[PDB]
Amino acid sequence: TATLGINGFGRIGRLVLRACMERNDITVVAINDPFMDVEYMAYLLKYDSVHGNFNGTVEVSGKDLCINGKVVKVFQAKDPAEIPWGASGAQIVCESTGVFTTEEKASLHLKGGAKKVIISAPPKDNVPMYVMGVNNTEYDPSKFNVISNASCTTNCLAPLAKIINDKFGIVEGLMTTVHSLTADWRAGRCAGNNIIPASTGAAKAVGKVIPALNGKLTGMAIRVPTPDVSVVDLTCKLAKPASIEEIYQAVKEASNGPMKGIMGYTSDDVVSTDFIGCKYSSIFDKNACIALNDSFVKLISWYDNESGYSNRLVDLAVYVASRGL
Amino acid sequence: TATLGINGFGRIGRLVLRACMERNDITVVAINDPFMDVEYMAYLLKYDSVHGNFNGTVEVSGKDLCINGKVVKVFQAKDPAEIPWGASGAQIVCESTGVFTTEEKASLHLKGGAKKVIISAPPKDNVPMYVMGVNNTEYDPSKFNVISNASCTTNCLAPLAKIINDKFGIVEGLMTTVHSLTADWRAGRCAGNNIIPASTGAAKAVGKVIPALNGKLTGMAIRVPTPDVSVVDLTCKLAKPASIEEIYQAVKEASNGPMKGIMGYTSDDVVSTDFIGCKYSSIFDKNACIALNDSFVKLISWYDNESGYSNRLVDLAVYVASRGL
Amino acid sequence: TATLGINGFGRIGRLVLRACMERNDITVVAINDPFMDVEYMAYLLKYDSVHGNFNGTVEVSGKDLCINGKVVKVFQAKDPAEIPWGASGAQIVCESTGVFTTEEKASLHLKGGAKKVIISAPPKDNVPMYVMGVNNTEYDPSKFNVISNASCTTNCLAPLAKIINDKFGIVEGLMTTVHSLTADWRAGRCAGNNIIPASTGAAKAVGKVIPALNGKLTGMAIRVPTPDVSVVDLTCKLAKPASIEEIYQAVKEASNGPMKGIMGYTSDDVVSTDFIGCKYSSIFDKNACIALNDSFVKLISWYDNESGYSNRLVDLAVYVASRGL
Amino acid sequence: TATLGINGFGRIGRLVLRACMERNDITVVAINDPFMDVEYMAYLLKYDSVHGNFNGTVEVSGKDLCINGKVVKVFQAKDPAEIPWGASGAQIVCESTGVFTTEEKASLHLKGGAKKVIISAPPKDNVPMYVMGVNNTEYDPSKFNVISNASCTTNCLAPLAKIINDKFGIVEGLMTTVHSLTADWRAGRCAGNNIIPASTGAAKAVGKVIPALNGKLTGMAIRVPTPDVSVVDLTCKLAKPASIEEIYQAVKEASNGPMKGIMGYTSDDVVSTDFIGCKYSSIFDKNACIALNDSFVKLISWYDNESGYSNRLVDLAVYVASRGL
């Protein structure tokens, strides 16, 4: 059974733990964050404005945490190499501080006894990025000790882009993602009452996760005042004509097939809040989609930027473990 | 000087009046709304959560209103044919109830003495739509007594699409407009905390205002919880190659020339709120635009869905009067 | 098991139904609402922007609904006397349209075969009000067939006031309740952008539920843009001096005793969202309470204005049934 | 004409500059912020999500700014002791970084050539606090070089409390101020989605600004998701009986005479947004006030926590200058 260590007890780190506590194939054994006291960590785990109260009990034991009775070690080393991951028994480390997004820095965890490291964000260098259901099987334990689970936006676009490209072929595509606040001068403006244009490298990252799409996609983001749940607006030109119904069918096939639990779909009159807590990486909104003609369409896909991503990072760890440490 | 009568004292109707009070070439002489008491009309004109306090003085005079010293006649006739527009000295009627959107219904104002009617929305029938700066000069006074000022979304897309189509040619385009709340099962969901997919006929409406674009554009909308100001996200393929810089220069030219006051532009890192009160119909956001290549681009254009549209209606009323009643 | 009939399938009626589905001592057998098709009712029950997806299954069956394998009859009669409550086997009717708040109108449900009626709001007439945990045992089945569950605000203030008045005696009190949007010219102003002063008859209602406090309290409300969960701010002069600690202990005793499931308490650094879904009628916030001295204090108590109230109405229905229908 | 220097170009600092630019009795000469380039400063000054575009022109001239044809030296020292105020000619400094709130830290601005310093926040040490219209004349230029302009909340409560105490006498009072987001573990929770209990020392601070009220007032705050404008809810016991109408008259008298421009009043059905941009320190809402009896009342007063406070700081600067530098 895989054991996890979390560095950076932020939104992501906290959600990863919550996702583990609900699973029987992965256990969180230790957490590290030099900027959080044990009591504060407990408080932050027990209450959340988006995901509700923690499903279980959280208490402080000495210097550590006792979650649902299980003990979770709590460290505060500003240097990855000094985090007793090994003594803690943590085999895989979830690097979610957003400060060690390079093999160089992230690999320091191995010096702490860790066998593998997953950066919860795209890397600054060439660390391989993996998107569950899209290219995770390309991972080779005998070649990589530090990998990346890309970003929340990339995890929404990649699976949809892959299904579409595989079936009809994407000649070119432009994406706009409408981001909730949990998903540059503009960025500093009041988030509560503004629609804010922003940058996202998701479209390009998809080009890396899916080589065939390199140079064929690019996009931007638009931040809106909602707390959680985002949407991908992908308008692309198809190499082979196709209707929304056929696109819908191809997505349904993948969703019920090779991408079970990763790609989802709906034909209901849903809105943002209906996906809070949804574990899917990408949910196709059939009725929201529109097409000018059989080769120029606009696809809409939902994603709980927090839940989907966090659960994918856990799926990735579990998968890594399954490949042998 | 042109005189105006307003039917329906809602958000648009009130803003049209506030726009007129600023101008010396048109005056509001009568308002008709069978569902609002004058005291309440006074209240709604004096205070606004988006546009601030009314600039001036508003007082009830008997059953009428006294605005900045001028007597504005108030009526409550449910039948447009029975509104005394003629006796009141109102030449042009701003039909903004949203209930009389066909030539048959709107023309009833003419029986009340009005000489011309402008529907503050797209027609359900074939009433001609005019967009200032785009096709308003096609208006023929000897042929139409009832016209339409289209919609806020069309007034944003039309001028931008015209420019792009005139200089580079639009092969095909797909639009997404992020709508503020002042701009169906989904529509009824909580607006305050949801991103809500929605429909708009603006892309097709542009296909009539600009016949050349007929069949080459389509789109949808996405509603978010901001009080005012929306954005048009146009992704299109050009017939001739063009860089963002050249597209910017084209808009800049039109903006400083044939579309002054209508098409605008910026290269600053603006956000939603920066356009509150802006009178332009469409503002190109240079830095927000992105290009995949020289023939496939995504253009971003802001518009205060309330202020721009309301000022265009006044401009159209003034233009109508200049052509002879 | 008592059976419930629901008139008016709005926010309250829907949550009352979702609460019943969580219990075995009460069953919903029918719903009446002339302004909703069966399809729409299903959608509204399945999806919700505050309480999440319906915990279970919902399908349309002919003209009725099948909820978790159970048949719930659907009617659309505008006259309460025309609703076949009796024929549907519904014993108690939850009157939640907000339009039949008098015995005269509410009793019309009895003509349909219903035995008891509970108005989900304070009555416009002398219909008796009952607050679970405060005065519900005063209910006399031989004297009333129509009763009221008061209001969400009253259900939060009554239990707290009773405890304080009994233990220390309330000399006089002034209340301010901060209302979420689910809880007059100002009332019609932009909700998600304003702090809006408003009215509430809670204080006076409490003087009727607890006679001894009649004329000793009065309050007002302040509406804010949060979706759900409200707060009661009670500032009062006590007959007998007391510290916040003593007041807390007092509330604690009641909460663990005679007011179990009704009065709650906490000493954690909670915020609004931590109470979404909480079923208590009132939750004392120890750390938010402050005192100028031992006989002049300000008490802060939370309440999910939707969940607490709806569950109290179900509790009252169960109770009423236990007393002889 | 006094000269002002601004340290910390945040919301307050900027609004303080915008206020100075509208007056002829004071001139902004320099700005310092170790975290902003001159370009970023110009941007933050020209655009604002709450107060609209800058009223005038903003241009970067070398390393400095040219605001409305006037030169404004720009610095970026992280230490007050190293800011060259003298050179620029800055006589009085507006210390608005929120970090140097002690005489020890704040007095360093003098080393730079600055004669007087006004902290835009309640001090941590014994630096004197002044509220224009209440106790600013107590200022002694021969004994203070570093003073405080109190807080936004204190500037709302003090004037009201002074009027009420002078006329009827306040025996005891408890305050709750509903704070907009621009006005502890809870503090860190998502602001745009929660009602958050908070602390404020405003009530106790009033006891120092008005010694007679020492020990007679205390209060708390409740933060809500509105962009700007807050409210003071003062529940107090009076020494002499008084009706809401009489209290209103006393406020009116103070407002039209001795406290003009500071204390204001209204009897309209106002809401939050109606006060955006209001320069008053406190606005009595007549129709929102309520009373249990002639000696126990709840007073409601509004305040633009940004505009009022900022203009008061500028008033205080001009006043400090009149007293001889």
Residue numbers in the entry:
A (entry chain A), B (entry chain B), C (entry chain C), D (entry chain D): 2 to 184, 198 to 339
Q: What does the paper behind this entry write?
A:
GAPDH plays an essential role in glycolysis by catalyzing the reversible two step oxidative phosphorylation of D-glyceraldehyde 3-phosphate (D-G3H) into 1,3-diphosphoglycerate using NAD (or NADP) as a cofactor. GAPDHs exist as a homotetrameric protein. We have determined the crystal structure of C. parvum GAPDH (CpGAPDH) in a substrate free state (apo), in the NAD-bound state (holo) and in a ternary complex with NAD and D-G3H. The asymmetric unit in the crystal structure contains one tetramer of CpGAPDH with subunits related by 222 non-crystallographic symmetry.
In the apoenzyme this loop, which forms part of the NAD binding pocket, is not visible in the electron density map apparently due to disorder in the absence of NAD. In CpGAPDH apoenzyme the distance between the corresponding atoms ranged between 4.55 and 4.93Å in different subunits. Comparison of the structures of apoenzyme and holoenzyme reveals, in addition to ordering of the S-loop, four other regions differ significantly: residues 35–36, 77–83, 98–103 and 180–184. In the absence of substrate (or analogue) or anion in the active site, the side chain of R249 points to D210. As a result there is no sulfate or phosphate ion in any of the CpGAPDH structures.
